[PDB]
Scaffold this active site. Structure first.
Site, PDB file in Angstrom:
ATOM      1  N   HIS B 107       0.821  -1.203   0.000  1.00  0.00           N
ATOM      2  CA  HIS B 107       0.000   0.000   0.000  1.00  0.00           C
ATOM      3  C   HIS B 107       0.857   1.256   0.000  1.00  0.00           C
ATOM      4  O   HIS B 107       0.559   2.217  -0.710  1.00  0.00           O
ATOM      5  CB  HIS B 107      -0.938   0.042   1.199  1.00  0.00           C
ATOM      6  N   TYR B 111       0.888   4.258  -2.839  1.00  0.00           N
ATOM      7  CA  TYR B 111       0.627   5.675  -2.590  1.00  0.00           C
ATOM      8  C   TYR B 111       1.793   6.573  -3.011  1.00  0.00           C
ATOM      9  O   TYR B 111       1.596   7.644  -3.612  1.00  0.00           O
ATOM     10  CB  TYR B 111       0.283   5.912  -1.127  1.00  0.00           C
TER      11      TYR B 111
END
Lengths: 287, 287
Positions: B107, B111
């Site tokens: 994740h 990002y």
């Protein structure tokens, strides 16, 4: 504080954010780990039981004990070593690597448990074997070594990096080799294939420790590094030449000692030091 | 204290993993393994032209949401590595947390990649990657989470609720805002990655609620409410005042209602009654 001197340990708010990629060689190793992802269910164990049944009593004793010792490693005192490194190291590329190392070590434990369940079906016999193995000197000796070189209040980060490298690269080096010996003999494809994947992973973890070492401002002395690794070599040699002799599966104990020293030498050179044993690799199948 | 809890008790560590003692925990680990993905699987090559047609207000909103996210998954990981994966003793639960650590690193990379793709100015980009210090409301959400990691005082049960709230209340409005962009047909890379990440966080939150069920000594309904209600106020302030969802054409009153709907659903899933009674106002968040 003193950790500000070490680029690896210097505290920052940038530890939570991955980009920009500042350490491309650490990142490349993380990507290598991601590319090696596997799960225990991928290893086909359906052809092993007939090969298992053709092993002699002495060979079954050896293999069932090696498997049990593999399973008992995760239980040991350094159950949180990787997590401890993941907390101390502040470089996000390295935390990503350690995160994958944690995951894959859990795959290793599952794999060993599956292997033991496939070859030793009687749960009474499994319970006997595990309960005995926990009392053995090889377990105790690895724990005392870790207490002494990692857990000690006087242990420096540099010393702990060398210790972690030895955990990954010296401990169990002889057991992996013994299972490769079974592969040369054409026995137990599930066991030997899983050994290939696990050994490769541990080799990658060890290489990563040696890469971390290269980034240290404060390295331990050559003398100290030798103490740590040489102590590991003696423990591993004793185990596979005296406690649980490799002669039980038809290998030569003197050559096994020579191999463990060859593996230690190679670790010392990869850490930037000179060889201490000068042992040649005696095993063509490990070439 | 922890001697009463099967999850935290040293006796719950087992020599080997099989046979499985907690089949529902194990099933969730297998669900997590089955969801494995890497940041490189998300094609971001069509987002930049959509980005370049967004209004100034829409760019401001999205870049700020990304900035919050950029730090956030890394803080969740620090807690797992420092606190949960270490203090929980049931091997099925450690396996789950090990995978959660891996996927949270995916994740963070995602990002970072998003920020790096949309923000070409390195001055503005450096400001966004350092949101944890350079943007106050982002700092507040991070300090809230960081305190529960450093907290020596609160019980495991309280801390599991807190981190369930981080994953299920603190991200909830931002996930929904990105699903709003999907309804409008904008930024396929951003929205597809949001779909994978929101699914993963939903699984992590469900796991927190499953852990909670295995506690013998639960925090009181009053205490659980205090934790979640506080999280709701912080999230509502962020998406209605600091970074208003009106900037991307959403209704702030309905967003407040949604955050409360998500909090209620967490309370019910933890075994308590609803406090807000909010209906889900968003048709696009039903299916």
């Amino acid at each position: 504080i003193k950790s500000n001197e070490e680029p690896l340990l210097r505290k920052s708010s940038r530890r939570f954010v991955i980009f920009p990629i500042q350490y491309p060689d650490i990142w490349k190793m993380y990507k290598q780990a991601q590319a090696s992802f596997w799960t225990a269910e991928e290893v086909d164990l359906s052809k092993d039981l007939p090969h298992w049944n053709k092993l002699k009593a002495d060979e079954k004793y050896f293999i069932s004990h090696i498997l049990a010792f593999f399973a008992a490693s995760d239980g040991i005192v350094n159950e949180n070593l990787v997590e401890r490194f993941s907390q101390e190291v502040q470089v996000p590329e390295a935390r990503c690597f350690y995160g994958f190392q944690i995951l894959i070590e859990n795959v290793h434990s599952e794999m060993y448990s599956l292997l033991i369940d496939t070859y030793i079906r009687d749960p009474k016999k499994r319970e006997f074997l595990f309960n005995a193995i926990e009392t053995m000197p090889y377990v105790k000796k690895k724990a005392d070594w870790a207490l002494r070189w990692i857990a000690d209040r006087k242990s420096t980060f540099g010393e702990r990096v060398v210790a972690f490298a030895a955990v990954e690269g010296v401990f169990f080096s002889g057991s992996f080799a013994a299972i490769f010996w079974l592969k040369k003999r054409g026995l137990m494809p599930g066991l030997t294939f899983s050994n290939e994947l696990i050994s490769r992973d541990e080799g990658l973890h060890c290489d990563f420790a040696c890469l971390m070492f290269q980034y240290l401002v404060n390295k331990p002395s050559e003398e100290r590094v030798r103490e740590i690794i040489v102590d590991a070599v003696k423990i591993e040699q004793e185990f596979l030449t005296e406690a649980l002799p490799v002669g039980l599966i038809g290998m030569n104990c003197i050559l096994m000692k020579q191999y463990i020293e060859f593996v230690a030498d190679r670790l010392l050179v990869e850490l930037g030091f000179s060889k201490v044993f000068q042992a040649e690799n005696p095993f063509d199948f490990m070439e």
